[PDB]
């Protein structure tokens, strides 16, 4: 059983996610159009940048995040943004066609499309496999948003100052998640452990992405196609 | 009469311009789509950035520019890019509808459209009036490209080191232009002086644009919609 405290935490996260994830993907038509070597880079740079703004919006609504210092907020986001984007994208991912279907055909992305922005199958193969395994967990929306919040509030991310406050926030979220599964998730005996392992898979995806980002951003002809927000967030600058 | 030296200068400029100005505007569909408050900013930021890359390409083909130091090349471009873009745009400007018609309807820009990127009529009124007066000069393609080259090779632009070399290059271009008009331009007695005054009008447009750019770029919600190349070139950093 949960307290009205743990309950309002879940309610806050679900509402935060609904305010930051447009199920109609109506803003996608504002992005540089997709073109199916680097033909998809302009469109995907815009898509990723738009997603970063949405992840920041989601984070600002996570209970306790707003009270952290501007420095820790930046620290948590620069480290976790790519992971949250990968996590939140499971909502459009389809096991049927192994693609991220974001509304119309123009915005249905397969492994073929996402390999046209400079990144290799070395990143994309594990990413698609991650989506598949995650989609098979059949997470309730409640567990989905809790997992993103837990991923974001990891005190072991570089640059973090108030470890105690952040660890306290994450431990509370994990407690809420274990209680939610036990009570609301039929046959979810091993789900929490499977969800924690996904966090470990995200660290590995973060590393491979960070590696490829570094290599690519070193070429100005490539980095010039990115947005100022992507350059800030995925960049290596430190507060 | 011109020498095969002055002649090849004109030939070099015309060819440079043909290699950097696509009369079909076929790349415009790759830009963030236009949307007719700041609704046109994403599309126009892309359009301006694409134009800057094309102006750099044009400059690299101007005889003598390539031999300047990387520092002077950067100096001349940061100072003149906005002017060359305004000058080169006269090619799509139509006195009939007072618009820049770049191919299809999606890319026909009127005063209404270009006022939706943050810039005010304080910049746009003089800009449209400049286009009108310039279009009425009925410049031959040869005079058009010479004027852009002369505008770019002004030794009195901030940060310029080799003034003598640059002044020598510009004086030679002006000589070629005066000779071309006298010989090839029927009734062009006062044209050269009218063309030189346009250079002065461009300095004034540069100033107003620089002023507005500074004000707008100070707001991150606005600057984040720009491209890395626009931020570099229109920014205030110095070599």
């Amino acid at each position: 059983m949960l307290s009205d405290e743990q309950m309002q935490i879940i309610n806050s996260l679900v509402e935060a996610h609904h305010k930051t994830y447009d199920d109609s993907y109506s803003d996608f038509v504002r992005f540089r159009p997709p073109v199916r070597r680097l033909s998809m880079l302009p469109h995907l740079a815009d898509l990723v940048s738009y997603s970063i703004q949405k992840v920041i919006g989601f984070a600002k609504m996570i209970p306790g995040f707003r009270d952290l210092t501007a420095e820790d907020q930046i620290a948590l986001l620069k480290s976790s943004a790519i992971e949250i984007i990968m996590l939140r994208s499971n909502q459009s991912f389809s096991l049927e066609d192994m693609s991220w279907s974001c509304g119309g055909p123009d915005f249905k992305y397969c492994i073929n499309d996402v390999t046209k922005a400079g990144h290799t199958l070395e990143l994309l193969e594990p990413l698609v496999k991650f989506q598949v395994g995650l989609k098979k967990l059949k997470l309730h929306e409640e567990e989905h948003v809790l997992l993103m919040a837990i991923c974001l509030l990891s005190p072991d991310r570089p640059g973090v100052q108030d470890h105690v406050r952040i660890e306290a926030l994450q431990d509370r979220l994990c407690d809420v998640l274990q209680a939610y599964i036990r009570i609301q998730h039929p046959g979810g005996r091993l789900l929490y452990a499977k969800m924690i392992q996904k966090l470990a898979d995200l660290r590995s995806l973060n590393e491979e992405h960070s590696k490829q980002y570094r290599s690519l951003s070193f070429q100005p002809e490539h980095s010039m196609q990115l947005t100022p927000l992507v350059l800030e967030v995925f960049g290596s600058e430190v507060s | 009469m011109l020498s095969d030296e002055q002649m090849q200068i004109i030939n070099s400029l015309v060819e440079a311009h043909h290699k950097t100005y696509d009369d079909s505007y076929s790349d415009f569909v790759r830009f963030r789509p236009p949307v007719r408050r700041l609704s046109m900013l994403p599309h126009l930021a892309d359009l301006v950035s694409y134009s800057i890359q094309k102006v750099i390409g044009f400059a690299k083909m101007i005889p003598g520019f390539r031999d300047l130091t990387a520092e002077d090349q950067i100096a001349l471009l940061k100072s003149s890019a906005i002017e060359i873009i305004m000058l080169r745009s006269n090619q799509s400007f139509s006195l009939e509808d007072m618009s820049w018609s770049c191919g299809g309807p999606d890319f026909k820009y009127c005063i209404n459209d270009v006022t939706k990127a943050g810039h005010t009529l304080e910049l746009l009124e003089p800009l449209v009036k400049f286009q009108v007066g310039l279009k009425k000069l009925k410049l031959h393609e040869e005079e058009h490209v010479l004027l852009m080259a002369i505008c770019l090779l002004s030794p009195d632009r901030p940060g310029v080191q080799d003034h003598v070399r640059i002044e020598a290059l510009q004086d030679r271009l002006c000589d070629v232009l005066q000779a071309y008009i006298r010989i090839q331009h029927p009734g062009g007695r006062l044209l050269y002086a009218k063309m030189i005054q346009k250079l002065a009008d461009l300095r004034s447009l540069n100033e107003e644009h620089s002023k507005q750019y500074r004000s707008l770029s100070f707001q991150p919600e606005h600057s984040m919609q720009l491209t890395p190349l626009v931020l570099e070139v229109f920014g205030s950093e110095v070599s």
């Binding site: 703004q53 919006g57 600002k60 501007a70 986001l77 927000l229 800030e232 600058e237 | 991150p220 919600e221």
Partner: peptide, 10 residues
């Protein structure tokens, strides 16, 4: 730096 980040974080 982090000009955009600071701003978006309100």
């Amino acid at each position: 730096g982090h000009k955009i980040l600071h701003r978006l974080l309100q």
